[PDB]
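Q: What would this complex look like in 3D?
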Amino acid sequence: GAMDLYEMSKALAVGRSPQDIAATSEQFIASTFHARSQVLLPDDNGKLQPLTHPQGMTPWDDAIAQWSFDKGLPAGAGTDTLPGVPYQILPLKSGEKTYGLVVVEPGNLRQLMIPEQQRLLETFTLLVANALERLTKLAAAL
Amino acid sequence: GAMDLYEMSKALAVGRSPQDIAATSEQFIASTFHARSQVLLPDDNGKLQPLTHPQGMTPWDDAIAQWSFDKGLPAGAGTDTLPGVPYQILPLKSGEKTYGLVVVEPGNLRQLMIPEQQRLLETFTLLVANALERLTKLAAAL
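A: Here is my prediction, written as structure tokens for the whole assembly.
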């Protein structure tokens, strides 16, 4: 919806931990895009977590997810890497830096892949990345 | 343009000071929205600076700008406060917190006030606010 980005922005603004941000991002991306989603965040070694998938989502390839994060490039539907899977693997990027990934598995892939929807989803991932960037840089400072 | 938000996001990501962010924001808002713009930032006392206007912009009311910042509400064209002026005064807000303002004076006010353009401009102000929030919170931490 028209107001969802603004509403998510308010919810992200008060997130206090990466988990808060991940939960908020999943809530909003799941409702606005009629999808199940999972945010993956790098650990101390730059390895994405969780390695498990939630009930209701199709398992994705963990190594291709790691590739997406490492290269800051999308994979899955809409790309030439795993073009046939029923989900998207999207980097959460601010500038050239990737702070995490979101895996998005829509109830209706043709609906998610409508270009206007893709452009909206890109804006959502930017706002999520900004929140992750803020929390990571603040934690490091402190 | 379609790609301007993403491009501004990349430029904001590498901003190192509020002045960097202000300059970037003015560059992009001015080009994407065919407008002149000025970002105003609070000083130590929460008073907006600069108090002067650049060549090429109509002078705005400094106290109404301060009102907009203090209340986190827009003024100028499109609002019931100074509805007749040829510019907008927009808070740069992340969540409930306002980090600054942007004054936007378009070459063609009817074009700027097209609702789709307003919705795009709102997204721009969100990204700018996020950058200001990041820099302010980091400076405070350090």
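A: To summarize the key features: Chain A touches chain B at residues 2, 5-6, 9-10, 12-14, 94-97, 119, 122-123, 126-127, 130-131, 133-134, 137-138, 141-142 (CB under 8 Å). The helical segments of chain A are 4-13, 18-32, 62-71, 109-112, 115-141.
Q: Very helpful, thank you.
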